[PDB]
């Protein structure tokens, strides 16, 4: 079903050049905000986390339990809907809510064939933020036990960046387990636990209150 806590104790054992001395907890339905300098090792950590909780070698895999959202918005050949679903069964109410929360409702409607507008090597090209919104919608649509969101906001104005964090990350995914690599202090205020990395090591693990008490 689910272990209410996962204790990671990587004291420079895995990915030694980038990651060194990271120790933290992840509990069900909590928003963990990974933050830190540029060379901290945020993406490396999400990748590390993933390679621990993943099925091993050649296993049937069936339903996958981790849902990853990379920085590099990916677009496979196929319709806007196919890209979001990504193999997973369609559900109109699950899909339409994910679209509205990821703020793609207006964008999809103006396009010619709407959800069936084909993307990739044979079809339409997309906006920088529009690719990032599809990449995020695809990740939040997948029902997974854990969500790794490496800088899901990019090429988005602070008006939509703070609206998608509020509607999608905090209102829609309120009960899912999130690990969100973020920068803005507003994201850190709404977080359940804050992990601050520095040059590959964990320097702070706690709440926004403890963080401001320490500084």
């Amino acid at each position, epitope marked *: 079903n689910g272990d209410d806590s996962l204790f990671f*104790s990587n004291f420079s054992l895995l990915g030694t050049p980038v990651l060194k001395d990271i120790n933290f907890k992840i509990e069900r339905g909590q928003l963990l905000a990974v933050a830190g300098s540029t060379g901290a090792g945020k993406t490396s950590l999400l990748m590390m*986390i993933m390679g621990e909780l993943e099925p091993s070698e050649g296993k049937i895999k069936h339903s996958g339990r981790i849902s990853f959202c990379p920085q590099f918005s990916w677009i496979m050949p196929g319709t806007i809907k196919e890209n979001i679903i990504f193999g997973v069964s369609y559900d109109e109410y699950r899909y339409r809510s994910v679209i509205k929360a990821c703020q793609l409702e207006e964008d999809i409607s103006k396009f010619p064939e709407k959800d069936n507008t084909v993307l990739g090597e044979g079809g339409i090209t997309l906006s920088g933020g529009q690719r990032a919104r599809i990449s995020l919608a695809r990740a939040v649509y997948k029902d*997974a036990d854990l969500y790794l969101l490496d800088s899901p906001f990019g090429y988005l104005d602070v008006l939509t960046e703070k609206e998608i964090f509020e509607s999608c990350v905090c209102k829609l995914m309120a009960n899912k387990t999130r690990i969100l690599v973020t920068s803005k202090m507003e994201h850190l205020k709404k977080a359940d636990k804050i992990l601050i990395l520095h040059e590959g090591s964990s320097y702070f693990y706690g709440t926004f209150s403890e963080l401001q008490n320490l500084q």
Partner: nanobody
Amino acid sequence: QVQLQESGGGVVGPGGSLRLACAFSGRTFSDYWMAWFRQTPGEERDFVAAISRSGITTSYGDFVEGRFTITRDNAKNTVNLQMNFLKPEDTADYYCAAGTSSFLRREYDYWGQGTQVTVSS
């Protein structure tokens, strides 16, 4: 084709300490995650501890509250469970399981024979 064999069981006093140890054999230990369970006769099966393929990720039963620690030696092929502050109610047969599934939704594919631990007041 794997086979497991626990050891370290015995009878310590109330508020004691004991170190259980299983033996993975027959395949690459590194590919499997481990787990510890217990069976207090008459009561339900209880999840005790679980450890990832590398050993960087662990998770414990709600009843441990900090007392037990799960470790592994991928070179010597063993998973160890260090139990401290054992209260009499922790008396049970401790089984060790190994799987090669997702760590979030675990499927305990293989099991051990169980070693008896007893906390005699």
